[PDB]
Symmetry: C6
Subunit: 182 residues, 6 copies
């Protein structure tokens, strides 16, 4: 389907997941942004979710099927490749130490991970022409932020499988003949 | 169960472990603190315990069970995931060579590890909805320290397993019909 | 077949693939350039494709056949080696956020890869005296660009197999004789 | 036993081994020094031996034993663990090149290692509640002293196994009853 | 058979190979030099080939033979070891983009490698008391060059097997005596 | 114990090997020198041999045998350990391009290696209470010398096995008695 359609669908799904998480855990507000912005921009203080695409795998020999155009007397050769892409998803949130109600960035990451692994969401995204494999690890990494202090940047990887289509032209034959020799 | 409840329970358990270890080995005093403080802080010159969260393991396919709400004619889908989290426990203590009564930081770390591996503590913590696996190594590391005096920072990691719950909605059907052809 | 002819054939094939991709996805314009420019150059602000040559495997023991020159009474020894050359192909394209029609550099790389894996292109290139093996991965890498805005540099590896020929001289014999001893 | 008793003992047998080695090879004098001083130090220009604790291995599931206190009607739960507590031994000596009688630092390290591997020393140590495993390697490393006079620093690792004890309380029951239904 | 004659024979063979390659591919001129310049030198701006020895493998237990000197009543013990040595062959050539006739440094490296693998070359070499094993890889590497212009430095490894001889003396016996007891 | 004597014997053997090599290959003159000099010293221009001791391996459980002292009524417990020592041998020689008679540093290293692997030298060394195992590699490395004049530093490893002894005291018993019960 190529990137743009997949990215748009993933953004919509992430927005829905973040809305569900906000109702579930009661954190103030959220944003969904892509990690590598093509223009000089600044981070947002709101609880944020990030995504990025990193490497790709073709997964299998290409499959070709032939469709015939009668008017022009040509075969249209369609080749389909079943591709797998891995997306990195990470979140960010700063912990105010004098608020009695506590929600962690790891909690947001875990909830977003669990939402995408549910069977209902898989059933819903099936009609969006892609499925999701299993997620096996979520890690907490600590850095020193920009205001100094300390902060966590949890992250995990997701795999999305879909189909890629290309179109080409080929000649067609309409009769056969031979010779027999003894 | 997520993080806040888990962290609070672990803090209470660590406080109890130090309460025991103080009569066990005759410390001056103790404190339990978390690593990665969100605010700038200074360390304390007393026997101290530090803990931190490293990563998570989903450990198995999600399990879904269905509960029916009769009034609104809806199924509420409950999905449970059995997660494993690794916490890194470390201690700090400075050795005064003049005192004749000697207690080591590695000694405190060993006692804390032994406390969590006892059968009685596991039986008591079972009602707190998580359990502990085995601990396989404790390591001593030496650093220069701010006062240019060599010091030890023993550490080990611990694993606790629990359940995470998410909640969603789904439609319900109340009748069936079909057609038979031959 | 040595490197230069292979490079020319690869260049014309890449130009054809780029024309097909432009008709497929509506690029502004394209360009095919080699990476390691001998003379100093400055790169172009267009959707471009890059290729480079790296590694070389001989793949098998050499095979020799003999052709006889009657006039000079000499054997001409021809030795053929079936070579496997690896090419790395990468692309560049800067995403402009405000335009609604979106095409990514990874899309260009994916289409170029898919073109070279099609069966019709293999049939066309066979009469050009080389064939292509399977491609197994594509990777996205993010760098900082000469402007201080982020960018992506997708890449993948391609394998091309062909034959190499060398000619040498050797003496010839025209009669035999022996002695029998008992 | 915890660190203090073990370290004091190891010091005592280290002094005994050094005395035996001095009678064996006619050293000037010797010292036994730990390789982590909490206070600033300066090291000594003498044939010295160094030791330090590296890490720990719990080595097996804990074993619990129950001892009953009749007066208070309580069980005292004793838990025993059997650890390994690897140590690192290293020596230092400067080789004066114009003395006929020659002894190397590697000689000191080898003799100290051989002393601890003898069966008589093992039998004597056994009454001190720990035992020694096998030693597999000794290595020479070249320093540069203090911007002069290249020097050698031999080292090797040693393992001493023992038991660790912890005590806890638990309730006790004195009678049983039941109900039979069919 | 030690290094000096090895290098002499190798440079003669490389000169012959380059004379053949010049006819085959029409270089302007060539030159063979070593990468072990004992004196400061400055390289040449001509198609150049380089060689150097990396290491050595003994390849087998030594084989001893005994030859008797009657006049001096001594055995001369000859020991032979079948040595394998590794040489690195690499080439340099700068690409002028304006010339229409194109030849690559990779082409020169490939031709030189192919020349040494031919049957006729091995037959010629055999009477020079060494042989060549199989070559398995050639790699292109790009560097900045002293004119700030990219260029390639292809290289590959070759293996040469030969024999080494040393001679020593040993006593000789000429009679035997015995005693029989029961 | 038993190291300085080993170095003295090894130095004598190396001097003999260099005498043989000088007669065999016509060196100007030679020197045998140990690395890691305990005093600030300078390298010599003459063809030189450098040796060093790297590490030791105990190779087997210790073996104890008992010798009885009748006068003092004590057992003298002798423990023997059969260790292996790894020595690194390297040579240095600067090539003069204008002299027609050529000898390489690798030739010196190879001749020294071959001398120690001969059966005659092993038989002669057997009376000196140690033996040599097999040598499996010799490598060339390039230094930079005096800011230019690249140079080679060939090296290889040798293994020497021997026995080392320790002596200790133990009590003795002279009679036995028992009790039989039923």
């Amino acid at each position: 389907m190529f990137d743009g359609e997949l990215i748009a669908k993933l953004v919509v799904e992430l927005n829905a997941a973040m809305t569900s998480a906000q109702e579930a855990l009661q954190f103030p507000d959220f944003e969904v942004v892509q990690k590598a912005q093509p223009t000089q921009q600044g981070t947002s203080t709101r609880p944020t979710i990030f995504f990025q695409k990193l490497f790709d795998i073709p997964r299998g020999w290409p499959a070709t099927d032939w469709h015939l155009d009668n008017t022009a007397r040509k075969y249209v050769e369609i080749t389909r490749q079943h591709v797998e892409t891995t997306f990195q998803i990470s979140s960010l949130h700063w912990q105010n130490p004098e608020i009695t109600h506590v929600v962690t960035a790891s909690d947001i990451a875990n909830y977003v991970r669990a939402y995408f692994q549910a069977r209902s969401t898989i059933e819903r995204v099936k009609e969006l022409d892609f499925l999701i494999l299993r997620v096996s690890q979520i890690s907490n990494e600590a850095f020193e932020n920009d205001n100094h202090q300390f902060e966590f940047h949890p992250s995990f990887d997701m795999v999305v499988t879909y189909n890629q289509y290309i179109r080409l032209y080929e000649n067609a034959a309409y009769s056969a003949d031979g010779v027999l020799i003894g």
